[PDB]
């Protein structure tokens, strides 16, 4: 779901 | 390095707008300028999980984790794709590493794995000698052996049946194995063939052995057959146990009707009342059992246990003491009392009572309480134990118990938990897996398989020096902070  | 970060951020922009193909293109662009950054590979795996390509998720999380093995998002993503692909052991491994840097994800994967292994394993064996001696303890051994009719003109199987019952009621390791064997033989011989009464008797005991071996359907078939041939209290008791409230009590009234003076009828019914919290009717039935067989220790025991469960420990203790005076050499007395004392929190007196019971059990020719005292003392000692003397003492007792009663799943489970605690994991796994085979119900089997599957992950974690060091550091820090 989340990108760095 | 700096332009690669700029490209990653451009890729992040495309990711946010759900343009995953453009995001991957920019992340791969960044990799072409700086391939040593794990985040780029990790970001690509986020794109592949959002589209549903689980295989590529594994490829790219792995590439991230080959650079940075503690990368949290790459560990979580890899575990997610692994779970989806059915690689539960792999998921559990990544989640365990993550937990060291989740708990319901790990448990979910453990339960998926345990359920899988149990089904594979599922697609004849007697319970422990201790359990058998306990089950048959209420019966009048002379009466049962003597119940074989010798007055038949056609029964050629009576003498074999007599032997089967003598061996059963000898209450010995070998006796149970021989009885099981000869009872099966007798049933076959009676199927081929006072005779009807003997046939029903053979089928009744072969039936209860099926119940004890966990063949519930085979138990009911031979028992109903036994009732059809010649109904006895035993057969109704045994069928009621096989089918365990309304039906249970119906069978017992039929047992009562056939012989109102048969002690085990009231004992077993009192046990159900006891379990159902009906202390009044339990008491009255145990008292009926006692009057009909005052030489049997078990009715006394249950009356004492009832006093404790009602919150009358002083009266219970006194009843146990009174029972001691009537039965001074029977290990059953201090064994059940030690159980009460343990539950009350009195571990000191429970150990003393278990020591008495062990001593009394050793001198008896028959099995009375078997390895019960060994398990009881060892469980207390393990709980009381940094205390290396008590821990190793608990190991010795449970090892002895496993050697004396090899078919006891309780002993194996007990020993395994301790083996696991001292990082004898291979031993723990084997014990847990043997316990799963020996286990009775589906939930007890799954429980033991769960212990084994969880232990195998521990083994896998421990095999890595870095993870092992991390695990030991965690424990050391915990203890120091305490």
Swiss-Prot record, chain A:
Assembly mode: Binds human HTN3/histatin-5, a peptide from saliva, and mediates its fungicidal activity. Interacts with polyadenylate-binding protein PAB1 and Hsp70 chaperone SSA1 on translating ribosomes. Interacts with NAP1.
Subcellular location(s) of the protein: Cytoplasm; Secreted, Cell wall
Top-rank taxon: Eukaryota
Additional notes on this entry: Present with 269000 molecules/cell in log phase SD medium.
Physiological role: May play a role in the transport of polypeptides both across the mitochondrial membranes and into the endoplasmic reticulum. A functional difference between SSA1 and SSA2 proteins is expected. SSA1 can participate in the ATP-dependent disassembly of clathrin-coated vesicles.
Family statement: Belongs to the heat shock protein 70 family.
Protein name: Heat shock protein SSA1
Paired cysteines (S-S): none
Swiss-Prot record, chain B:
Subcellular location: Mitochondrion outer membrane
Residue ranges, Cytoplasmic side: 1-482
Keyword Phosphoprotein listed: yes
TPR repeats: 4-37, 39-71, 200-233, 234-262, 263-296, 298-330, 331-364, 381-408, 410-442
Single annotated GO MF: protein transmembrane transporter activity
Stretches of the chain forming a coiled coil according to its record: none
Signal peptide: none
GO annotation, biological process: protein import into mitochondrial matrix; protein insertion into mitochondrial inner membrane; protein targeting to mitochondrion
Cellular-component GO terms for this entry: mitochondrial outer membrane; mitochondrion
This protein's record includes keyword 4Fe-4S: no
Keywords carried by this UniProt record: Membrane, Mitochondrion, Mitochondrion outer membrane, Phosphoprotein, Repeat, TPR repeat, Transmembrane, Transmembrane helix
Membrane topology category: Single-pass membrane protein
Primary localization: mitochondrion
Extra facts: Present with 4110 molecules/cell in log phase SD medium.
Assembly notes: Interacts with TOM40, TOM70 and MBF1.
Summary of the function given for this chain in its UniProt record: Involved in MBF1-mediated mitochondrial morphogenesis.
UniProt similarity note: Belongs to the Tom70 family.
UniProt name for this protein: Protein TOM71
Source taxonomy: Eukaryota, Fungi, Dikarya, Ascomycota, Saccharomycotina
């Amino acid at each position: 779901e989340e990108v760095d | 390095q700096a332009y690669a970060v700029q490209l990653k951020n451009r890729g992040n922009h495309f990711f946010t707008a759900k343009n995953f193909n453009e995001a991957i293109k920019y992340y791969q662009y960044a990799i072409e300028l700086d391939p040593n950054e794990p985040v780029f590979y990790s970001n690509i795996s986020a794109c592949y999980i959002s589209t549903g390509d689980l295989e590529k998720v594994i490829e790219f999380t792995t590439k991230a984790l080959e650079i940075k093995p503690d990368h949290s998002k790459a560990l979580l993503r890899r575990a997610s794709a692994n779970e989806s692909l059915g690689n539960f052991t792999d998921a559990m491994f990544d989640l365990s590493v993550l937990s060291l840097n989740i708990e319901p994800m790990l448990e979910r994967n453990l339960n998926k794995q345990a359920m899988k292994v149990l089904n594979e394993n599922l697609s004849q064996v007697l319970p422990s000698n201790t359990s058998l001696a306990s089950f048959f303890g209420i019966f009048d051994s002379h009466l049962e052996v003597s119940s074989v009719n010798t007055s038949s003109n056609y029964d050629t199987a009576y003498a074999l049946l007599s032997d089967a019952l003598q061996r059963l009621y000898s209450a010995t390791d070998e006796g149970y194995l021989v009885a099981n064997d000869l009872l099966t033989k007798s049933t076959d011989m009676y199927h081929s063939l006072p005779l009807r009464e003997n046939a029903a008797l053979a089928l009744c005991y072969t039936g209860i052995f099926h119940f004890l071996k966990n063949n519930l359907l085979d138990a009911q078939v031979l028992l109903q057959e036994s009732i059809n041939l010649h109904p006895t209290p035993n057969s109704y008791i045994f069928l009621a146990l096989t089918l365990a409230s309304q039906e249970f009590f119906k069978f017992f009234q039929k047992a009562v009707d056939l012989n109102p003076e048969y002690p085990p009828t009231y004992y077993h019914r009192g046990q159900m009342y006891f379990i159902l919290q009906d202390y009044k009717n339990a008491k009255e039935d145990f008292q009926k059992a006692q009057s009909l067989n005052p030489e049997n220790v078990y009715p006394y025991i249950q009356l004492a246990c009832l006093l404790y469960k009602q919150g009358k420990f002083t009266e219970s203790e006194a009843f146990f003491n009174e029972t001691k005076l009537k039965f001074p050499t029977l290990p059953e007395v201090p064994t059940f009392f030690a159980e009460i004392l343990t539950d009350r929190g009195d571990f000191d007196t429970a150990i003393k009572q278990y020591d008495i019971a062990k001593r009394l059990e050793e001198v008896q020719e028959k099995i009375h309480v078997g390895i019960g005292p060994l398990i009881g003392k060892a469980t207390i000692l393990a709980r009381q134990s940094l205390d290396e003397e008590k821990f190793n003492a608990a190991i010795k007792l449970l090892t002895k118990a496993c050697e004396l009663d090899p078919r006891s799943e309780q002993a194996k489970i007990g020993l395994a938990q301790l083996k696991l605690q001292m990082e004898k994991i291979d031993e723990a796994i084997e014990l847990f897996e043997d316990s799963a085979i020996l286990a009775r119900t589906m939930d007890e089997k799954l429980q033991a398989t769960t212990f084994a599957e969880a232990a195998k992950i521990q083994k896998r974690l421990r095999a890595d020096p870095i993870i092992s060091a991390k695990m030991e550091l965690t424990l050391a820090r915990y203890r120091a902070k305490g």
